[PDB]
């Protein structure tokens, strides 16, 4: 497995980028009544594999060495999105009507003072319940939010990431893609109806 050129120089700013994006995340999270799921720095092997595969060996192109998630109630997601934009983040607002898989949420990239990008995602508890496995949703939401969301959910949780995995491995001309994407949109739509 080939170390990318300049890899360690980029990797060493990741702790400082983490502190920076974690500080702004918990600011904004504690502003609107939400929580921040902080995460460690991307592991070395995976960071290198992702630089080599997604970014053809350029380590300055990887954006999620440092990352976290802001979990807020549904109608605050948008407010938080605008907040990250005002701090210069690159912001992707996903609505379920364009994404072939019908997911919704916010992703943003922040160029931190340490000289590398940080990733801050934002979503509601309902969306995270829907997309992530139970183990994952329990960590992101905490045990009590998880249990509250699951009791009031109208759909079994945790199917979203499943559909993504089945869709992602398909060849771009696959006869199977369209049916999987439809199943994913119908799933996330049922979540959002309630």
């Amino acid at each position: 497995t080939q170390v990318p050129k300049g890899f360690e120089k980029v990797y060493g700013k990741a702790p400082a980028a983490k502190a920076e994006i974690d500080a702004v995340a918990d600011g904004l999270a504690a502003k609107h009544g939400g929580r921040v799921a902080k995460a460690p720095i991307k592991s070395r092997e995976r960071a290198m594999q992702k630089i080599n595969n997604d970014y053809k060996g350029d380590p300055t192109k990887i954006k999620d060495l440092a990352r976290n998630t802001i979990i807020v109630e549904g109608d605050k997601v948008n407010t938080v999105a605008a907040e990250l934009a005002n701090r210069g983040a690159k912001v992707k607002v996903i609505d379920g009507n364009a994404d072939p898989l019908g997911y919704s949420g916010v992703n943003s990239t922040m160029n931190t003072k340490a000289g590398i990008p940080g990733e801050i995602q934002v979503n509601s508890p309902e969306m995270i319940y829907a997309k992530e496995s139970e183990d994952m949703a329990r960590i992101l939401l905490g045990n009590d939010t998880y249990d509250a969301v699951a009791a009031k959910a109208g759909v079994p949780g945790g199917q979203g990431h499943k559909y993504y995995e089945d869709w992602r491995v398909l060849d771009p001309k696959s006869p199977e893609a369209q049916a999987i994407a439809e199943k994913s949109r119908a799933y996330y739509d049922a979540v959002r109806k309630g």
Binding site: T109, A177, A181
Partner: protein, 76 residues
């Protein structure tokens, strides 16, 4: 978005994904994906069809023309 299926079998497809400053070229005859990042020449190494960033480009990017792709986008 550029959904998998009909279009990729129909013809060449060119994709802009501005969130990550990346473009892709699909050659339907050869069945190959190539990547071109903003401000760069196209990478010679083909891209695997289950590649993470490519599938992000399908979900969240937009279709462009062959001329737009070949002209390229200034580095962000």
């Amino acid at each position: 978005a550029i959904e998998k299926g009909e279009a990729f079998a129909r013809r060449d497809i060119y994709i802009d994904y501005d969130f990550e400053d990346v473009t892709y070229r699909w050659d339907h005859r050869q069945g190959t994906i190539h990547v071109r990042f903003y401000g760069e020449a196209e990478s010679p190494e083909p891209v695997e069809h289950d590649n993470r960033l490519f599938n992000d480009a399908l979900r969240f990017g937009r279709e462009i023309t062959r001329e737009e792709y070949e002209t390229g986008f200034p580095k962000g």
